[PDB]
């Protein structure tokens, strides 16, 4: 016959029973975990449920090891994820406990409406039962009652979202299984055979659309019969109804006109994102490709441009959208549906103390000598350069912003310029810092210019509104911007960095745009003398091209020269040759700290805000007076990169605050200012050889 039938090794009743038992039975190594979660959900302190597959695997293995049979719910979900969502939703709805807290005036309108709907359901059921019993024409009575009455379906009474998360490699390895759902893949490797599965993709985000309401069920109200009509929608477009469909209007001769009711509708928060290949995954001589991701519900706003992430999702198809003339059969377009996001570098803003972080941080601080121990751990394969490594660490930590009132503001970030002879690993240090930073961006001269920095006006494909796409500076907001070949930049770009490093903003006034952008970022610049090697026979300011004011506005400026020395050359050569012969550093008395723990400690330190007192103020003013008195004589002899100015005092203050924060103290101390002055002094040591 037409539409034959086929037999598969899948039974849904057994799986549903197993789901119910799992939801009501699981215990982690207190009552059931998921039952407590449901109690919170009913009490209205939660919105999302996360189902982990490691729990399911543990449940299955526990059932097996003691003999009783169990099905491979893990494999079933992995292969046909999209179908189990409804099974889980129904299983949960069959078990949701009652609310233990009354509904008050400080609750959500959504919850109010849901409660009203449930009470109304109970009212019709009771009324129908009473009416039927009155006739004198209990399971049969109940059954006829459900059969002869209309209700609000469960989906219009649910209040929570449900998501899955993949199987951990550790758990699969311990249980002797192969975690397919948690093997990272590139957009290159995702082919058609993977459709309908739960898979993990490793990539870098490039574009994210704004959050907008996506409709799932439209609601209309009929004034004639007082009914509510619900129309499902699962397409990119739909058609509104005109005439009633309720039973009364259907039977009657005069039908009422439907109207639209936004509040009763069922909306979803929807975003679309574009993910791109990583460099190391692209084959030789090819261009990276992209992929489309959809985010629905409470998982929105979890992705921002420039993030390197692992996204778990269900791979689903979509209707074809190319030209008709090139269509050959039933071609389809693909996308990923998001379920779980894992960042490769945890943002500072999301910091929160906890036993696991506490033990590691206390271990590190107990080990002692935190300052030097961290400083030596930045790019440990580069020899020497301890002072610049310390300065870079202080730049990473940052200072303290100050809100002085009356609308004014004082920056709290540190700006560093390295200026050196060729072949001293400036680019290596730049790249290492950009990698260690959680929002570090990297740039090189003519590669990016104009709208490459700042932002440009474009039109969103998803929505029909105009938007601004940011450049490197906006992408590096609340982070580090590393610039190579600083002196080769164009005048417009130089002015852009000028204004950013002045007041953390960028003003644009051009055809079709009149606005200001926020660029709360730190600057780490690299530069090379104007004649290649430094010429001691010429003044420092004539040895460089950038404007003296631009040099001055930097908090820290280092000069790096290559003076041959038969002693230190031996040490450097031994270091480099050891680094090549192995893949590790040579020192054995020092153990470097990994970037994860470094980020942990820096994030913790950023929570502090030390303050300044009178003794330190007196010391600072005396030091500033002495330094300002001295610098004038040097500048007169044309042997200084710049005269001392109040920006120097502000830089000293910021460095002292950063050192205090690193020490993890609310109180600043004289030794911090001592170290800051030591650094700012040694900044120009090589100029006096």
């Amino acid at each position: 016959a037409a539409l034959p039938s086929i037999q598969l090794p899948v039974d849904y009743n057994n799986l549903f029973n197993e789901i119910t038992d799992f939801l009501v039975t699981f215990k982690q190594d207190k009552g059931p975990k998921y039952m407590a979660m449901l109690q919170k959900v009913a009490n209205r302190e939660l919105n999302s449920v996360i189902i982990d597959l490691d729990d399911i695997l543990q449940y299955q293995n526990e059932k097996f090891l003691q003999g009783t049979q169990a099905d491979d719910l893990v494999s079933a979900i992995q292969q046909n994820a999209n179908h189990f969502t409804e099974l889980f939703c129904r299983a949960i709805d069959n078990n949701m406990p009652l609310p233990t807290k009354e509904i008050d005036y400080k609750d959500d309108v959504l919850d109010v409406i849901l409660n009203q709907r449930r009470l109304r359901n109970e009212r019709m059921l009771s009324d129908r039962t009473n009416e039927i019993r009155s006739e004198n024409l209990n399971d049969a009575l109940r059954e006829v009652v459900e059969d002869e009455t209309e209700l609000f379906p469960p989906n219009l009474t649910r209040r929570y979202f449900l998501y899955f998360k993949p199987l951990s490699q550790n758990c699969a390895r311990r249980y002797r299984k192969k975690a397919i759902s948690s093997k990272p893949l590139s957009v290159r490797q995702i082919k058609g055979d993977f459709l309908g599965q739960l898979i993990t993709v490793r990539g870098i985000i490039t574009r994210v659309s704004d959050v907008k309401p996506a409709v799932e069920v439209i609601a209309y109200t009929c004034d004639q019969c007082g009914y509510e009509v619900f129309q499902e929608v699962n397409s990119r477009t739909f058609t509104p109804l005109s005439e009633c469909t309720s039973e009364e209007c259907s039977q009657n001769q005069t039908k009422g006109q439907l109207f639209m009711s936004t509040r009763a509708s069922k909306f979803s928060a929807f975003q679309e994102c574009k993910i791109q290949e990583l460099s190391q995954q692209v084959p030789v001589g090819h261009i990276p490709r992209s992929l489309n991701i959809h985010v629905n519900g409470t998982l929105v706003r979890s992705l921002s441009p420039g993030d390197i992430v692992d996204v778990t999702g269900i791979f689903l198809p979509a209707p074809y959208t190319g030209f008709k003339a090139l269509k050959a059969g039933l071609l389809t377009e693909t996308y990923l549906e998001a379920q779980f996001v894992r960042q490769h570098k945890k943002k500072f803003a999301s910091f929160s103390l906890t036993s696991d972080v506490e033990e590691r941080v206390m271990e590190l601080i107990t080990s002692g000598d935190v300052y030097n121990r961290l400083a030596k751990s930045i790019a440990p394969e580069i020899y020497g350069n301890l002072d610049v490594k310390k300065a870079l660490l202080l730049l990473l930590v940052g200072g303290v912003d100050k809100r002085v009132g009356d609308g004014m503001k004082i920056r709290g970030d540190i700006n560093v310029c390295l200026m050196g002879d060729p072949g001293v690993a400036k680019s290596q240090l730049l790249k290492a810092i950009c990698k260690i930073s959680p929002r570090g961006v990297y740039t090189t001269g003519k590669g990016s210019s104009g709208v490459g920095l700042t932002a440009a006006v474009m039109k969103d494909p998803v929505t029909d509104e105009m938007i601004l796409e940011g450049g490197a500076l906006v992408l590096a907001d609340n982070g580090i911007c590393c610039i190579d070949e600083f002196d080769k930049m164009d005048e417009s770009d130089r002015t852009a960095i000028h204004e950013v490093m002045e007041q953390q903003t960028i003003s644009i006034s051009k055809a079709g745009i009149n606005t200001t952008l926020n660029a709360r970022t730190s600057i780490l610049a690299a530069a090379n003398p104007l004649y290649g090697r430094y010429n001691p026979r010429l003044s420092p300011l004539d040895n460089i091209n950038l404007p003296a004011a631009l040099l001055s506005r930097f908090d820290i400026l280092f000069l790096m020269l290559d003076i041959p020395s038969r002693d230190d050359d031996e040490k450097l050569a031994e270091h480099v040759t050891y680094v090549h012969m192995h893949n590790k550093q040579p020192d054995l008395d020092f153990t470097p700290v990994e970037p994860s723990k470094m980020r942990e400690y820096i994030a913790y330190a950023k929570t502090k805000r030390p303050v300044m007192s009178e003794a330190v103020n007196d010391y600072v003013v005396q030091a500033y007076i002495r330094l300002r008195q001295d610098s004038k004589r040097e500048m007169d002899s044309k042997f200084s990169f710049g005269q001392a100015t109040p920006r120097t005092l502000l830089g000293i203050i910021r460095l002292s605050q950063a050192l205090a924060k690193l020490r993890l103290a609310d109180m600043v101390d004289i030794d911090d200012v001592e170290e800051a002055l030591r650094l700012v002094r040694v900044s120009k040591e090589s100029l006096y050889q």
Binding site: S5, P317, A379, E381, G423, Q428, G452, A472, N583
Partner: protein
């Protein structure tokens, strides 16, 4: 229903496969590999048209002239043999001489329709690999049954068939609702490409001709734009050329395209496709024997461009560049370069361009460029384009295509700062960074560079220091691993000798050299040794603390260059570790270059 001629052709092709015994064992090997490893191999093999001609001329002509009647029988015979020999359907590909059926997009006319053809050209644009729906599966809630349906279209079969446009089911036969099973459905890939006549053969001043091609399943992503390609397939016509219905329009004709079934990339000079040769056991024995002699480096060095006189050190340097060093990546994520770079400055009749062209011709993957010929985006791939799908992206440039290969630059001094700054990053970090409106990416550009330049005063002057004679940024000169200076001085004996040599010309082989280079670069990766460590340390210290006037400055780049040269010489030696001899050769060559 069964057809007598169809069965007869099946039997005849079965006899062919029986008389020839390579394809049976090939199929057995494919099945054995798949069974053992469960990666999976496709169910396809290749046949020799020459063998077919020798066996049965009638069947040969039948396949060549009427594939629609002769291929499906052979495919069925192959499938039957595979299913019989084993403890999806299989497919066929063709190699051999096509005689008059080897054409080009310009010489492909309507008289070749429905006949198997082989076209050569350059890929101009590919399409996005999309899945195609074949079989759909559904589940019934009210009954607990699984239903399915099948689909097909015009391009999946050679013989015309009566359309059967089955609809997508949403209800059961009884009226119940249906649920879709994406994981239990079946999808197949599909791509479309365009091929154009090569620019080395197309008429000049005349617009080019192009032809479409459709690829399916396991032939879906075997090429990229800009490749030289040879495609063997069936040239077919589809649809009705406006005949059906009135269709008053008469201008349009019949749609045509190729149901491609074999695709081959071809190597060419100044192209992104690398050359690769198959190595035989005789080749391996010969190369391994040759490696054991003591003057192998000298022999290989002299083998290069024997038509030119002298320049032994430059020949050795070119060989070292070809072999290359080794690059290191640390767990932290740091990258350490392993390529080599060469610059030559000399008098204007010293065969600089000749050596440049020789390296272009012999290198497996090389791209040639001149000073002002390519500028701006043409070098860094900084151009942006977009299709009708709305997405913008990049298309590769000189150095980007040159990844893992060689770039020859002629008239080097003629460049500008806008692109010298750009090439700084390529020569040191081996990456390219782009940031335009809506694009922020990074492209790997791991390539080596050979360049030649002229002195400022026409002829090299010995009365001035090298700075005035070269006049190039010191930072740039630092990035080049080796710099050579060559001057022609008149001398009766040398002039005599070059005269006899040139007159001789005017009245080891390269292929074996290429095989040697391929094996050496693919198989062996040596490691450092304490002896070499000490030798390099001593030599670098001496150079840094010597007062002699040099042509180039000294940095840590010199130490890294010494290490790279030692490793490359070890690679030439085919040893697993660098040695004192290799270190000394590297030091001696560097000293000769500098002094």
């Amino acid at each position: 229903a069964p057809d007598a001629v169809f069965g007869d052709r099946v039997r005849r092709f079965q006899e062919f496969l029986d008389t020839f015994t390579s394809y049976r064992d090939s199929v057995r090997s494919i099945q054995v590999y798949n069974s053992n490893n469960a990666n999976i191999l496709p169910h396809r093999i290749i046949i020799s048209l020459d063998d077919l001609r020798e066996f049965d001329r009638s069947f040969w002509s039948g396949i060549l002239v009427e594939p629609a009647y002769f291929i499906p029988p052979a495919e069925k015979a192959l499938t039957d043999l595979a299913d019989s020999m084993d403890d999806h359907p299989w497919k066929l590909s063709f190699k051999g001489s096509f005689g008059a059926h080897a054409l080009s997009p310009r010489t492909l006319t309507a008289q070749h329709l429905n006949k198997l053809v082989s076209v050569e050209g350059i890929v101009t644009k590919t399409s996005l690999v999309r899945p195609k729906l074949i079989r759909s599966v559904h589940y019934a809630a009210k009954t607990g049954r699984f239903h399915y349906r099948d689909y097909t279209d015009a391009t999946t079969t050679l013989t015309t068939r009566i359309p059967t446009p089955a609809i997508y089911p949403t209800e059961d036969t009884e009226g119940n609702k249906l649920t879709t099973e994406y994981g239990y459905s079946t999808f197949i890939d599909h791509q479309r490409i365009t091929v154009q006549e090569m620019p080395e053969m197309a008429p000049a001043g005349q617009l080019p001709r192009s032809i479409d091609v459709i690829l399916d399943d396991d032939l879906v992503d075997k090429t990229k734009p800009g490749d030289r390609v040879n495609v063997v397939g069936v040239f077919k016509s589809l649809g009705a050329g406006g005949m059906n219905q009135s269709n008053s329009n008469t201008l349009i004709g019949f749609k045509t395209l190729i149901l491609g079934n074999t695709v081959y990339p071809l190597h060419a000079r100044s192209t992104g496709v690398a050359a690769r040769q198959m190595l035989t056991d005789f080749d391996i024995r010969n190369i391994n024997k040759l490696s054991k002699k003591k003057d192998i480096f000298d022999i290989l060095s002299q083998s290069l461009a024997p038509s030119i006189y002298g320049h032994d050190h430059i020949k050795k340097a070119i060989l070292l560049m070809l072999m290359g060093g080794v690059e290191k990546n640390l767990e932290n994520g740091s990258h350490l370069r392993g390529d080599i770079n060469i610059l030559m400055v000399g008098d204007p009749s010293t065969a600089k361009s000749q050596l440049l062209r020789f390296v272009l011709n012999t290198a497996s993957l090389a791209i040639a460029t001149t000073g002002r010929g390519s500028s701006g985006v043409g070098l860094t791939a900084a151009v942006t384009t977009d299709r009708e799908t709305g997405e913008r992206r990049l298309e590769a440039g000189a150095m980007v295509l040159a990844d893992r290969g060689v770039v020859c630059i002629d008239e080097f001094d003629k460049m500008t700062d806008v692109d010298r700054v750009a090439i700084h990053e390529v020569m040191e970090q081996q990456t390219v960074t782009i940031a335009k409106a809506g694009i922020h990416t990074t492209l790997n550009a791991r390539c080596s560079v050979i360049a030649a330049a002229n002195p400022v005063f026409g002829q090299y002057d010995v009365n001035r220091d090298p700075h005035q004679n070269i006049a190039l940024p010191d930072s740039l000169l630092s990035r080049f691993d080796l710099l050579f200076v060559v001057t022609d001085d008149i001398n009766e004996i040398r002039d005599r000798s070059i005269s006899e040599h040139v007159l001789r010309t005017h009245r080891v082989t390269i292929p074996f050299l290429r095989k040697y280079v391929q094996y050496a670069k693919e198989r062996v990766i040596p490691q450092l040794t304490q002896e070499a460590i000490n030798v390099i340390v001593k030599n670098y210290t001496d150079l840094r603390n010597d007062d002699n006037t040099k042509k180039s400055p000294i940095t840590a780049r010199t130490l890294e260059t010494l290490i790279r040269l030692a490793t490359a010489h070890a690679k030439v030696r085919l040893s697993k570790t660098v040695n004192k001899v290799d270190a000394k050769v590297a030091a001696n060559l560097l000293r000769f270059a500098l002094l």
